[PDB]
Amino acid sequence: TGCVASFPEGDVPPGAVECLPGQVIRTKVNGEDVMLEIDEVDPGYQVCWFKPDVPLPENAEILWSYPYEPTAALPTGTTWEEGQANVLIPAEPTPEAAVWPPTPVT
Amino acid sequence: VPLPENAEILWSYPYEPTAALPTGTTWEEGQANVLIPAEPTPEAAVWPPTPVT
Amino acid sequence: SLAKVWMYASWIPRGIPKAMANELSSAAAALAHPEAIARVAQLESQGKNPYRVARA
């Protein structure tokens, strides 16, 4: 529930849950139950979970948000659109298959 | 809380979690029949004037 | 000065329970759920005593 927001460093809004490097977050993303581990938050900025009860500060950027579904038992989570999040699949370049040298025969 | 079947919302509130002072409701004409008491002011008690010929 | 005299006189009284206080504060920051800690901060911004709220 709520939203995750990036905002410049300084005073924390009362009610916001800080998300420091090493923070693990169980969520649902496009129907997929996932764990997000925070790694290398940029300088001069910090990330926090803002419940709907908590007002957002100025100059805040909603990285991703959740819908309002209080009656729902199984929440839907989020929907990271193309451009909202840059997901990188590892290339995994399959190297050349190790071939044994054929000896020549005249 | 999920609502049951055959339920009739008499009046509802908006979603305002960040709000400190809530707005409450807005009973539209036809949503609620509010009755003001008529309070019919009766005739002012007049003293009978006696006649003089 | 007199402030320094009072400081150096009250150091040993004031510092006897400081260890347990910091221990409890840190253990609370560690073991307590961060949603609960955020709610405490929220109520403190709302001017309320969250301990009284919790008991109530």
Side-chain angles (χ1 to χ4, degrees), chain B residues 2-25:
Chain B
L3 270 73
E5 206 185 338
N6 212 339
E8 297 177 327
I9 287 151
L10 309 173
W11 72 89
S12 72
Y13 293 78
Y15 188 53
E16 278 173 344
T18 44
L21 290 157
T23 59
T25 64

Side-chain angles (χ1 to χ4, degrees), chain A residues 14-17 49 51 53-54, chain C residues 34-36 38-39 41-42 45:
Chain A
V17 181
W49 176 31
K51 304 194 186 155
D53 306 327
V54 193
Chain C
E35 298 187 7
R39 177 141 189 270
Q42 201 182 27
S45 68

Side-chain angles (χ1 to χ4, degrees), chain B residues 10-11 25-34:
Chain B
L10 309 173
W11 72 89
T25 64
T26 47
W27 288 355
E28 295 292 323
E29 307 185 0
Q31 183 170 8
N33 193 34
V34 180

Side-chain angles (χ1 to χ4, degrees), chain C residues 16-41:
Chain C
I16 285 150
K18 282 187 186 161
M20 278 198 305
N22 296 336
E23 200 165 19
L24 278 163
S25 161
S26 62
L31 298 166
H33 206 63
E35 298 187 7
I37 287 155
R39 177 141 189 270
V40 162

